Amino acid sequence: TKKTQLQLEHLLLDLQMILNMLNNYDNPKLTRMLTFKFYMPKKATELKHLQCLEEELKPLEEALNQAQSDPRDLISNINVIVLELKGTTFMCEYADETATIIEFLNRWITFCQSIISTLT
Numbered sequence: 001t002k003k004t005q006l007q008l009e010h011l012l013l014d015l016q017m018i019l020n021m022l023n024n025y026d027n028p029k030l031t032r033m034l035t036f037k038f039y040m041p042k043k044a045t046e047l048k049h050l051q052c053l054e055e056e057l058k059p060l061e062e063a064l065n066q067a068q069s070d071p072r073d074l075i076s077n078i079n080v081i082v083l084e085l086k087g088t089t090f091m092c093e094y095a096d097e098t099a100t101i102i103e104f105l106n107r108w109i110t111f112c113q114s115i116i117s118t119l120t
């Protein structure tokens with residue numbers, strides 16, 4: 001339904017802001033930002049695969065908390081949107097390799113645009 005398209009766009013904008021918050025703030029800890037490793041979904045083609053994102057929302061916040069600029073507010077709005085799109089409690093599978101926070105955000109930003117392109 002269109003209600004599903006709206007919520008993904010809301011989710012896309014929040015993910016869009018976090019990615020733009022790192023690609024414009026370069027001086028603060030180019031060191032520390034590239035060291036966090038996030039677990040990637042094996043296959044992200046269905047709407048239920050947001051379980052792989054929900055479980056990493058808390059580690060995403062702890063990485064953003066080390067950058068002073070509000071991270072706690074953005075992660076909460078992301079959490080409520082994810083809980084309204086994937087919701088059975090399915091067993092999400094992860095890839096073997098970990099990725100950077102930049103690659104992690106681009107993966108789910110691409111995921112939302114992929115599902116938003118599917119519904120339209």
Ligand SMILES: [Mg+2]
Pocket residue numbers: 097098099100
């Ligand atoms: Mg890698």
